[PDB]
């Protein structure tokens, strides 16, 4: 359950694909709370649902109750079905208790959870 | 048949997969892959059941050379992204290279380039 605003948006039957410009994706849970906000300086929408983020990729928590606060990164991928997200740039996650740095991101916004892959990096070392 | 939508502003609602467009451009395609019909307006809705209700300022505009139908004019309008049928039920005006014509209510379709007004008709003849 999501709600997507964009500045601009085209779209093409015959590839079934829009491109957004400066998206703000927000997702609600079950009660309908704002829960996380997905913002990019360009997007594209393929009818598989899939969601490729362009430019400036920046995840906020938006509620209080979630240890990881922020996801920033180059580019990003969400799969709207499974609520997935991974990239294959670096990532920098911040969390309530500590930040990190590192190649690669693997992570659901359901299960909140966000995982590094390579060349990991913590603020507290 | 292809179409091609462009906007500069969108909102998407996933639990309605209704999403509201503002100043939304639509171009539509024939059997051959042509350009054929140009619709503009203020405001658009695009439902599941690819139905686009268009609000305010609605001009349809000819594409083509060979057509009689050259223009259609009328505050708010319906049309069928697949079929292409096309209806109003405000006040419309036809414009034809033969003459143009006032009335209320429209029936019609841009894949056959057909038009007709229901009530009160007023002709250029």
Redesign the interface.
Known sequence: ??????????????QAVSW?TQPVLTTFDKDKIPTWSVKADKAKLTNDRMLYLYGHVEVNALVPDSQLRRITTDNAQIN?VTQDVTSEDLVTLYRTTFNSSGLKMRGNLRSKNAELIEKVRTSYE
């Open positions: 359950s999501y709600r997507l605003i964009a500045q601009h948006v085209e779209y093409y039957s015959d957004f709207l």
